[model samples]
Target: EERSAATREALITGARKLWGLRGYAEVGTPEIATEAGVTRGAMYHQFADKAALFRDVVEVVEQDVMARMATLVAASGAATPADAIRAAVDAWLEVSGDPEVRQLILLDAPVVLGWAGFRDVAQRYSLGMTEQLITEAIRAGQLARQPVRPLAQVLIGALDEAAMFIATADDPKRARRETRQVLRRLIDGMLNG
Candidate 1:
């Protein structure tokens, strides 16, 4: 009982520190132990390995992010296609740009864990939101008739890649402006093409 409690405390502290730093892979057990004010053995005692600890961290972080985004997206409005689209992009930008989100989810999570698995989890978590936004656009007559799922997937990919660039760029404003411009062109072309 005593060991279990100590190990749990170590893991809880380790998870927080790991998320703050580079993420799971970038943070060593020694670093985590240092942050937790415990020994490396303590971290290993609670969790099987870094991967297991990361799983818990990712689950907590993912749920928190998704929950926040869902709230923001909904509150942004669902009255029009343009509004929904803007909300989608804006929400993504806000989320990925947040310091904690950027460090933990955007940058470190995939590198620490398996990239493929992380990506799969991300897709599963965000797909519903993507579908909702696309459906809103179609219902509002903002999108021309086409496969909604495919269009949503393509647009989402574009948004994710672009937002990531914006977050990592030295001149974030310029990157954001260019991204907005490109997105505008793409939307305009899609609408009238």
Candidate 2:
């Protein structure tokens, strides 16, 4: 268990580093293996190939995405979907600023996995969870009845675009302030308007 734990830790760490730098494809097995402090053979033992490793990376990051959003919404802690939406935007912006996440998932998602593949996973993992959350919120009367799926998509899409803008910003400080205002306003319009 100790050895396994160490190896997994190394893999995750190396993945973060690679994602921060050249993104997915630009970093090869040798590079990852070296940084991971493991043999190339060991990585293959843990995962099938670069694609397999990438899939795990996606899973890890997506969970983080969910947790961060949950934190923002949890603060509102009320039975209101609108409040959750506000939190979601804040968390989305926060996630986009993560360097490893920016380089790997956002920047390299299309190049490495193909947009279709990336979207497929996103739907199953991220979008699916989001839609489920909205439905539950509505059922609980914390939210109003509406087109749950489409609304989730729209909300997530807007946040994603905003994230890209912030993550790739030449002046991140300015980007953060502007994007925060933009997201807050968008949520206000979306929830109230």
Candidate 3:
């Protein structure tokens, strides 16, 4: 179990580094294998083609993406419902210093895997997370009781667009602060007594 699984992860890590720098289209399988310190055959043994390797990279990288956001909120223990909502994304902007990683995770994957394909994995997690927070707040009287479904989706849409803006903006760091300003207002509006 440990043997090829280690090799499989090595391949994924190696590819992510390269793809982050030059992008998926610019890099080749030979470079990927070389970067992994393995042979071309070793990569093929683990994956069908470049796209196959890219798919694994997507999941593992996104897994890191989720863990970064999830870990912060978990440990920090934001008390308010809105605190959790804001805390979740504050984790991402601070940890997501790599623009290449953002472009790869957010933009390229969508083009590669299609919009709905990524929603099945990455978007679903965050969306469900937001939905649960909304659900619990309504129950606990932190938020006014109302339809949680569309409300969750709407907030998710706002946050996702905010991230997308941060990724492509000329100055991402500046964009994040600006976006945070707006999102805070958006959620504040959502949470009124």
Candidate 4:
């Protein structure tokens, strides 16, 4: 049992690193085993197959992503609902700009897992946080009582696009400033308009 557990952790740790760097399609089972310093048989032993391994990796990575976002929110010291909303948007944009995060969670996960599967995990991890923030804003009368679902939907979309702009730009420092400025405007409109 101890050996099995150790092997499983090795697989997960190695796969997490490889997947972050190379994404799902580029990394295979054999590579996973080699990276983990285990045999291919151990890979199959721990996970049913490559897809299963990738699924588990995504789960673990996403949990780490969620924790970071929560920490950002807690650290923001946002006093108003609008401030909270802005802080959440900024947090996501900053985190999602990381190459690993941009590749795995934003770009690859949705395409690899399909919309429903990705949405299922995303809504639970990040989207739900945005939705709850919107709910709080409305409750506190800081934001116009807009439909939380649609508001969150659009805001999340904006955040994703902003992150992509920053991630892909040749001049990311400038792009970061531009993206933040645009996002802040949108947040103000959402809260007040």
How much is the lDDT of residue 68 in candidate 1? 84
TM-score of 1: 0.77
Rank ordering of all candidates by TM-score, starting from the highest = 4, 3, 2, 1
lDDT of 1 at 25: 51
Which stretch of 10 consecutive residues in model 3 shows the poorest summed lDDT?
Answer: 92-101
Instruction: Give Cα-based local distance difference scores for all models.
Output: 0.73, 0.74, 0.78, 0.81
- The residue ranges of model 2 lying beyond 4 angstroms of the native Cα positions read 1-9, 76-79, 136-144
Which whole-number lDDT from 0 to 100 does residue 109 have in model 4? Answer: 80
> What is the C-alpha lDDT profile of model 4 across 105-128, one tens digit per residue?
877788777889987887777678
Root-mean-square deviation of candidate 2: 3.2
Q: What is the lDDT of residue 171 in candidate 3?
A: 88
Tens-digit lDDT track for model 3 on 78-193? 87766776686677666555666576777778788777787776665567677887887787677888888888777767776777888888988799999888877766777643
Question: Which tens-of-lDDT digit does each residue in 97-189 have in candidate 1?
Answer: 777777777677677666788878888788887887677667767777688788877877887788679868999878887888788777766
Model 1 lDDT-worst window of ten: 184-193
Question: Which residue ranges in model 4 land beyond 4 Å of their true spot?
Answer: none
Off by over 4 Å in 3: 1-3, 75-77, 95-97
